[PDB]
Amino acid sequence: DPETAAKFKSKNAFPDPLNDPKCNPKSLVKKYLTPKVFESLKNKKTKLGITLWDCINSGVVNLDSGVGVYAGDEESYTLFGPLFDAIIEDYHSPYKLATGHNSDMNPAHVKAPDLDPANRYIRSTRIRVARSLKGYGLAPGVTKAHRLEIEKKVVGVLTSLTGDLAGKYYPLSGMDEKTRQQLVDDHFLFKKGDRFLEAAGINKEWPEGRGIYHNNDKTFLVWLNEEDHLRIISMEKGSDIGSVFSRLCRAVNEIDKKLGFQHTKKHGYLTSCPSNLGTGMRASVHVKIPHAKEHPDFENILTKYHIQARGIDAGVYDISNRRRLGLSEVQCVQDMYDGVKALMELEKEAIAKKRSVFPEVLKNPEVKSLLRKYLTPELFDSLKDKKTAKGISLYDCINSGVENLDSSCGVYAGDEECYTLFAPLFDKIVEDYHSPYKLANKHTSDMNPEKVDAPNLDPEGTYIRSTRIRVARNVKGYALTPGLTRNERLDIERKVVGVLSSLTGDLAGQYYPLTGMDEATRQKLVNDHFLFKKGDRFLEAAGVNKLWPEGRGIFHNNDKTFLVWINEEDQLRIISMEKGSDIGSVFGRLCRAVNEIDKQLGFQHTDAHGYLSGCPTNLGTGMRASVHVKIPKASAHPDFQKICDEFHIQARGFDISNRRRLGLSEVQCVQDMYNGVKKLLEIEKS
Numbered sequence: 001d002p003e004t005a006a007k008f009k010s011k012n013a014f015p016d017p018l019n020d021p022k023c024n025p026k027s028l029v030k031k032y033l034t035p036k037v038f039e040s041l042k043n044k045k046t047k048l049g050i051t052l053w054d055c056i057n058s059g060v061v062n063l064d065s066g067v068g069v070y071a072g073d074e075e076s077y078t079l080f081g082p083l084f085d086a087i088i089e090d091y092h093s094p095y096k097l098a099t100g101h102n103s104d105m106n107p108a109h110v111k112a113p114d115l116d117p118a119n120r121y122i123r124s125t126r127i128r129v130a131r132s133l134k135g136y137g138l139a140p141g142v143t144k145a146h147r148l149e150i151e152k153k154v155v156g157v158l159t160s161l162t163g164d165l166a167g168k169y170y171p172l173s174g175m176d177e178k179t180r181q182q183l184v185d186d187h188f189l190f191k192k193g194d195r196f197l198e199a200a201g202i203n204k205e206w207p208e209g210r211g212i213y214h215n216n217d218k219t220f221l222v223w224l225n226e227e228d229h230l231r232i233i234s235m236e237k238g239s240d241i242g243s244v245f246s247r248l249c250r251a252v253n254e255i256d257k258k259l260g261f262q263h264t265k266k267h268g269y270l271t272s273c274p275s276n277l278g279t280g281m282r283a284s285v286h287v288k289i290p291h292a293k294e295h296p297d298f299e300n301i302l303t304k305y306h307i308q309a310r311g312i313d314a315g316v317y318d319i320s321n322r323r324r325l326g327l328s329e330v331q332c333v334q335d336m337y338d339g340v341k342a343l344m345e346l347e348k349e350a351i352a353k354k355r356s357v358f359p360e361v362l363k364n365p366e367v368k369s370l371l372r373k374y375l376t377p378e379l380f381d382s383l384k385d386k387k388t389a390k391g392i393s394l395y396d397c398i399n400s401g402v403e404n405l406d407s408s409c410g411v412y413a414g415d416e417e418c419y420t421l422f423a424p425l426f427d428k429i430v431e432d433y434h435s436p437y438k439l440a441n442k443h444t445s446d447m448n449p450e451k452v453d454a455p456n457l458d459p460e461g462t463y464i465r466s467t468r469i470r471v472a473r474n475v476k477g478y479a480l481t482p483g484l485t486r487n488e489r490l491d492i493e494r495k496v497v498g499v500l501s502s503l504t505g506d507l508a509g510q511y512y513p514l515t516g517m518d519e520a521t522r523q524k525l526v527n528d529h530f531l532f533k534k535g536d537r538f539l540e541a542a543g544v545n546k547l548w549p550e551g552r553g554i555f556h557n558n559d560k561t562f563l564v565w566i567n568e569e570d571q572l573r574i575i576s577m578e579k580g581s582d583i584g585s586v587f588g589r590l591c592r593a594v595n596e597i598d599k600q601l602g603f604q605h606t607d608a609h610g611y612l613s614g615c616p617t618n619l620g621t622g623m624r625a626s627v628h629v630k631i632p633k634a635s636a637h638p639d640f641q642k643i644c645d646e647f648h649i650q651a652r653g654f655d656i657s658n659r660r661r662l663g664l665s666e667v668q669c670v671q672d673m674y675n676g677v678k679k680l681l682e683i684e685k686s
């Protein structure tokens with residue numbers, strides 16, 4: 001009811017609408033703005049001309065207000081003290097203004113070893129602070145010129161930031177619809193203030209003087225002249241709150257050194273809304289704690305570390321500090337860290353207990369996964385307490401098969417060591433799926449295209465319609481896809497993109513990261529059938545979809561013959577494809593690119609398993625050679641089945657592909673693909 005409140009404001013009369021027609025019982029302005037308080041202060045004005053009615057207006061206009069007051073300037077907090085002091089000490093109880101507040105923005109005082117590098121629990125981390133500049137009023141009392149001055153001074157500081165803090169400023173006045181659309185996508189844009197901010201006078205001269213700064217990494221974000229002069233945000237996926245706090249402090253302290261902030265001993269940093277006083281800080285973490293949420297100690301942990309939990313997928317909560325006043329920013333972050341760590345240990349207890357016994361669901365005879373076939377309780381009990389150097393357990397490896405009972409295999413490797421440490425399971429699975437290959441036989445890799453003699457089969461394209469060869473590779477030195485930490489995944493993306501951008505000739509192309517993928521870029525790539533989406537339930541349970549879509553992307557050449565998927569199911573899925581028949585050309589292109597990547601980075605590889613992958617089906621050559629070919633006549637001939645078995649290739653309604661991956665080189669596999677097709681099309685002249 002803006003129109004009603006204006007009538008009282010125009011008379012400078014007591015705001016009757018506070019006398020609950022439908023006013024919030026908890027409303028602090030209703031509680032502390034009494035007739036005598038109003039009478040005592042209604043004629044007082046700050047140097048900036050802020051009145052009591054200016055400060056209380058939002059709370060009278062918006063009767064559902066929890067707080068209902070905004071300060072126009074620093075003087076408002078003293079001049080209208082009797083009102084603000086009561087509101088502050090009630091909202092921030094048991095804080096006492098007489099006690100005082102101590103700020104601390106030294107990140108070195110924070111002790112925060114990274115809680116969750118593997119991202120088993122924590123999804124994202126974010127720290128926000130609100131700050132106001134010296135020499136000016138607060139948001140409701142800022143003049144038109146002052147706001148422009150603030151924009152000018154802040155941008156000057158922000159545009160001179162270096163390192164990971166370097167970035168771009170986007171003012172709201174103007175902003176191409178293109179730019180706007182992009183910022184909405186990143187969730188970096190703020191809109192006109194809601195009814196609470198409107199009634200506080202915060203939307204004055206919208207959108208003049210308002211703007212957005214972000215660094216190139218998009219891990220640092222500043223809102224200029226929104227609810228306060230500055231809303232400064234440091235954030236990233238994963239759990240590294242110490243890193244997040246450090247980046248925040250570097251930027252905030254630099255701005256403070258050049259401009260200075262509004263700050264008192266009793267209020268801490270000054271903000272428009274009294275709720276944001278003190279640290280002006282909200283430190284936050286998104287974390288999956290379904291089991292901890294139901295533990296009886298849950299609420300007592302929140303109370304103990306002074307944190308709160310809010311609903312956001314399933315079991316994922318927003319954990320943030322409850323306190324602003326009476327504690328330092330350092331103490332606030334530390335309490336956040338300790339509370340989250342405590343809740344994480346709870347979650348780890350429940351999961352460890354549940355993983356301590358043999359998965360009873362595997363005892364069902366309707367389950368026909370390889371996991372069920374080979375994993376006995378005795379084998380489980382022999383392996384269950386063991387972990388690789390990266391902390392990968394047996395249960396980590398079989399999790400997808402236990403969560404998805406309809407798995408064909410159900411077992412993934414988090415790292416190379418899994419194939420050794422959990423050999424009594426992996427050996428059986430490998431030798432079963434890749435039967436009759438024996439691990440003792442060892443495997444020979446060979447990516448020399450000159451050792452293939454494959455003259456073109458069907459240059460008319462009479463039968464063969466297209467030729468596709470894919471290889472799966474993983475980068476040496478890292479875990480496999482299910483076991484990747486956040487930093488590993490990003491590091492792999494950076495290195496591979498660095499290599500792919502050095503590719504010349506017809507290998508030249510560019511990289512399309514899934515993160516920051518607009519609309520025009522997406523739907524296009526999809527038409528080419530180049531786009532890959534998020535993994536399914538099997539990959540999710542394996543740990544392949546962690547931090548999606550961070551670090552994922554697509555590279556293709558101009559001719560669209562050479563394609564690379566980065567950090568999908570394997571770290572590198574490399575595809576060469578074209579035309580109709582020339583198997584020898586596809587492979588030559590494939591080898592040129594793969595060998596160059598191999599030379600710069602290296603691949604995970606053993607004698608026994610060939611090229612390593614998270615999924616045992618992709619071992620050895622890690623290669624799929626496929627032929628699309630019209631063969632009506634030979635498919636019914638009594639030699640067709642003799643042929644497929646003799647050359648160990650499979651035919652599927654008419655996809656012609658290799659069945660073998662282990663115990664043969666890539667040269668040998670391609671040559672056999674050729675020869676098999678050669679005798680198949682041979683009958684297409686019966």
Ligand SMILES: Nc1ncnc2c1ncn2[C@@H]1O[C@H](COP(=O)(O)OP(=O)(O)O)[C@@H](O)[C@H]1O
Pocket residue numbers: 124125126128235282284285286318
């Ligand atoms: N740890 C986090 N990771 C990612 N996003 C977050 C995190 N914490 C909060 N957010 C998002 O930031 C947005 C604004 O946060 P909000 O709860 O309004 O805090 P603030 O008062 O600092 O703006 C919300 O949409 C919320 O989903």
